[PDB]
Structure 1
Amino acid sequence: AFQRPYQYLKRFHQQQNLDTFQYEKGSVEGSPEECLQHFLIYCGLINPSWSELRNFAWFLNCQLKDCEASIFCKSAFTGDTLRGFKNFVVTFMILMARDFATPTEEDLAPFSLRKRWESEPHPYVFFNGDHMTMTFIGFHLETNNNGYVDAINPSNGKVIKKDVMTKELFDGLRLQRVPFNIDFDNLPRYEKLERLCLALGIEWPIDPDETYELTTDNMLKILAIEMRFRCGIPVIIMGETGCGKTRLIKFLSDLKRGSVEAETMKLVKVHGGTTPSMIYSKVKEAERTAFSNKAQHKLDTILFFDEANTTEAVSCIKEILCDRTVDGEHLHEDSGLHIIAACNPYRKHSQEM
């Protein structure tokens, strides 16, 4: 997980071609401090933790794994004019990592002060695992006067990521007919559902509930959640009780299961009275249910914690997924279970209130 992004970014540091195959499964020469510094500099954070670097590492790992899952490298080999694409890839991965995991009264400074909201760009590109294409939601591309293409956002304008790549990649992908710059504010329900099921790696798209209007921001948040618990990053959703959260991942799980009538979404209401024993019991029972579902259907269940902040056991809600442990026993990485939690924001009342 820490190796492959290191192998790519070490060669990305000094501008060099990468047409030679990578992932040799053996450790090439590498030193601790050089890779540590390289991960530090390209992350954006000036004072990052170790968890943030781990999160960036797993995100790059999962993104490169998606890249090798598709046949883009093989198509580059067989078409013989597709290189330099990986440079645009890696630049965009830095961009979405900066969109993902670089956060930032005198006592709510760490908690209430939220430097980033949903009123920020979400340029989202995924290499789907079920198919051999790529999909884009949440951003637009526009050509510039220096021969390159810049990224712009809806409702405003922005000049992020100047000087990305040349025109040969654009010509190649236009030959491959991949949906670049598709605006989802004027697309019908069937096509948006097809794109969503293409992105989540879901086969045989079936409508679970037509009444669930699925906006562009809904693409962004659903795919962010799925990406978060695909790459292994803990899923904590800092949305107010106003925002629709339970319905969101209920819809996600309903699509994920497809047509089975088993129990795939376990909704645990977290609450002030949630003693730690409550949490371990619920997680263990849902973990046995996860064994059953994975063994019988090759299907992944989800354990969703509602308002997982009012309890005094938020550390219990943290250990189950940050370091993969429940009540002091190492949870099984093979088991198969997506544990997500929804944490309420922090803000004082208005003084008159």
Structure 2
Amino acid sequence: EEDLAPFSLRKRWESEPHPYVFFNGDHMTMTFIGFHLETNNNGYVDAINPSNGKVIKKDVMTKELFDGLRLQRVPFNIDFDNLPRYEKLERLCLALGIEWPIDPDETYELTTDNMLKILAIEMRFRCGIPVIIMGETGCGKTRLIKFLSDLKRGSVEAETMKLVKVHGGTTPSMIYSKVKEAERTAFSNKAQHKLDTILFFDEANTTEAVSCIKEILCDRTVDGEHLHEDSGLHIIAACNPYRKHSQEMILRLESAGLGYRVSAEETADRLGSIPLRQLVYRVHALPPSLIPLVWDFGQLNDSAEKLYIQQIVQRLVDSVSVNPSETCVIADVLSASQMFMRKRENECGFVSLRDVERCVKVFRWFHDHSDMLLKELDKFLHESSDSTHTFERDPVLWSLVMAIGVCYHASLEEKASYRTAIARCFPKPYNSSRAILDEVTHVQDLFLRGAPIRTNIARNLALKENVFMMVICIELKIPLFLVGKPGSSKSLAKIIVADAMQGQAAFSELFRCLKQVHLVSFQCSPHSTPQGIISTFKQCARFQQGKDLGQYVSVVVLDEVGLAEDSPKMPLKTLHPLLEDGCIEDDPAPYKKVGFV
């Protein structure tokens, strides 16, 4: 696209060859990594990459010199498919100049492009080139750099990597203060341990202060003052990609309920002629002289994604007593649901590897509570149905069905296709889509009946879905956003949930076994400052302090966030940090992270 042409046109990906040589720091050897040396029939030796045959750069090495490199015994022409972990680790410590290494993360695998990325980044801030990485949120950027920091520090308890989560409301003064304190602790770490400090700006593309970050690394200056060259300090910046939504979701978004408060041509938040409302990542334009310095990682090509979601699920099932085999059932049903999200021209916001651990958190909530929920479901289905829905339910597979019921099935509009595409992975009690639909229908009926009774109510599928989702995401402190028409029974759900979700003064027994909720409302307006939003968060956190947080949850309910959409006061810009750690301009704590409707 003409407005995304300097950015979206990646002239190359990671999947194009990376022929590297390095001369080792403490050792006196060479590393030939990323390419192979083969013999030509003209008496010359050429560079050929693995995984295909490409004979790029004929006439590079003479064959008697190649024989000489046999004589002085360089580690030449080695593929890193058949090396064990200790040998790859000692090739890393010889190449990265690290003395006496350990293996800091045995779960983190070392394939050959992870070596090339680690050695590439280390070369870039060994010579002086700035390090800017343009990759998506799902790909392994923070894991690779934390492995690099833990490998470069070896064993010392000091603080080497500092990760700054840049959001849209990140002002320049915070970034300047954080670079100065990172510079102070960089001097302190070099003075005590002879060790250098990495400052990792994550998502360094969402703010208007990205040019400020250009001041930090492209010409090495902090608000007019220079950075000391012999201090020991490296700034790595990560950026979100630029792509426009495919047109059908922009159709379903302009028509979701009442439409946007502003139009698409008289809106103020642009990049070129494109609104930021219509982009997948809310990115501002990179300044030039960082465009020829940014380069791309991989994109998680869907083969190794199963491995990463398996490590995440085995680290968050806590399978000391769950199951041996149903963890694999969780893993491949989540892989199938992620592939269903990929087998469509869009996702919501490309939520890969963060929706999965949130959804495993939901599964853990259900499986911890799958003792009274199944008794109440047995009671309800016996008093209100036949013996068809009166079978014994597995307390692990039912929780998985409801996990994908609230993670993926609730937001989608093509729900029946999702159910018939996800039922090919489940075992015997959920082989059909009808069984999953019946199960979520009966448990939504169970939570609507656990509420106090109402007559002349619009008892429909929308009210049941909204009550069910709101009860769960208030229990788990997941934010939920609800757009509908002005008669969608979406504020009636707020009333009946806020009256039913009392802790010990509840009506039924299911809600008596859950948390107490006191909510502070704030009706947004086009004339809304962000200070009111910060005051509402601090007020509900003031309600939440001093109490048992397993039986008390505060939740902010913002009532007209559609009216605060493109207001020039920009009140929702502060919303993105306040939903993550619960407070801006303060260190996180308990009684600060609050629920959000």
Q: TM-score, normalised by structure 1?
A: 0.69
**How far did residue 200 of structure 1 move?**
0.4
What amino acid maps onto 2:162 in structure 1? K
2:334 alignment partner in structure 1: none
Deviations 1:87-133 (A, max 9, x none): xxxxxxxxxxxxxxxxxx00111000001001100111100111100
Q: 1:202 pairs with 88, 92, 98, which one?
A: 98
Residue 248, structure 1, aligned to residue 144, structure 2: yes
**How far did residue 350 of structure 1 move?**
2.0
| Alpha-carbon distance in 2 for matches of 1:238, 1:154 | 25
1:297 alignment partner in structure 2: 193
1:238 alignment partner in structure 2: 134
What amino acid maps onto 1:223 in structure 2? L
**How far did residue 290 of structure 1 move?**
0.2
Deviations 1:182-212 (A, max 9, x none): 1111211111111111110001011111111
What amino acid maps onto 2:61 in structure 1? M
What amino acid maps onto 1:337 in structure 2? L
1:162 alignment partner in structure 2: 58
2:69 alignment partner in structure 1: 173
Deviations 1:223-252 (A, max 9, x none): 111111111001001111121011111110
| Alpha-carbon distance in 2 for matches of 1:242, 1:176 | 44
Residue 190, structure 1, aligned to residue 111, structure 2: no
Residue 283, structure 1, aligned to residue 179, structure 2: yes
Q: 1:215 pairs with 91, 111, 120, which one?
A: 111
Q: 1:143 pairs with 30, 39, 48, which one?
A: 39
> In structure 2, the residue corresponding to 1:213 is in which secondary structure?
coil
Residue 113, structure 1, aligned to residue 6, structure 2: no
1:350 alignment partner in structure 2: 246
| Alpha-carbon distance in 1 for matches of 2:181, 2:3 | 37
**How far did residue 268 of structure 1 move?**
0.5
| Alpha-carbon distance in 2 for matches of 1:120, 1:343 | 21
> In structure 2, the residue corresponding to 1:186 is in which secondary structure?
coil
What amino acid maps onto 2:104 in structure 1? P
**How far did residue 162 of structure 1 move?**
1.1
What amino acid maps onto 1:320 in structure 2? I
1:328 alignment partner in structure 2: 224
1:318 alignment partner in structure 2: 214
2:236 alignment partner in structure 1: 340
1:307 alignment partner in structure 2: 203
Query: Bigger shift: 191-200 or 153-162?
Result: 153-162
**How far did residue 340 of structure 1 move?**
0.7
1:44 alignment partner in structure 2: none
**How far did residue 351 of structure 1 move?**
2.1
Task: Kindly report the root-mean-square deviation, in angstroms, between the aligned alpha carbons of the 2 structures.
Answer: 0.9
- Higher alpha-carbon Rg: 2
What amino acid maps onto 1:271 in structure 2? H
Show the 5 A alignment for 1:64-103. none
| Alpha-carbon distance in 1 for matches of 2:190, 2:208 | 32
2:438 alignment partner in structure 1: none
Greater relative contact order: 1 or 2 (C-alpha under 8 angstroms, separation 6 or more)? Answer: 1
| Alpha-carbon distance in 2 for matches of 1:249, 1:322 | 20
Unaligned runs of 5+ in 2: 250-597
> In structure 2, the residue corresponding to 1:346 is in which secondary structure?
coil
2:403 alignment partner in structure 1: none
Unaligned runs of 5+ in 1: 1-104
Q: 1:132 pairs with 16, 23, 28, which one?
A: 28
State, as a whole percentage, how many aligned pairs show the same letter.
Answer: 100
**How far did residue 352 of structure 1 move?**
2.3
Show the 5 A alignment for 1:265-284. 265-284=161-180
Contact 2:46 2:61 (8 Å CA) reproduced: no
**How far did residue 151 of structure 1 move?**
1.0
What amino acid maps onto 2:97 in structure 1? G
**How far did residue 180 of structure 1 move?**
1.2
| Alpha-carbon distance in 1 for matches of 2:61, 2:37 | 12
**How far did residue 168 of structure 1 move?**
2.4
| Alpha-carbon distance in 2 for matches of 1:351, 1:144 | 52
Q: 1:263 pairs with 140, 150, 159, which one?
A: 159
Contact 2:124 2:131 (8 Å CA) reproduced: yes
> In structure 1, the residue corresponding to 2:247 is in which secondary structure?
coil
Deviations 1:121-174 (A, max 9, x none): 011110011110001221111111111111111111112111113122212211
What amino acid maps onto 1:233 in structure 2? I
| Alpha-carbon distance in 1 for matches of 2:26, 2:78 | 21
> In structure 2, the residue corresponding to 1:181 is in which secondary structure?
coil
2:125 alignment partner in structure 1: 229
Q: TM-score, normalised by structure 2?
A: 0.41
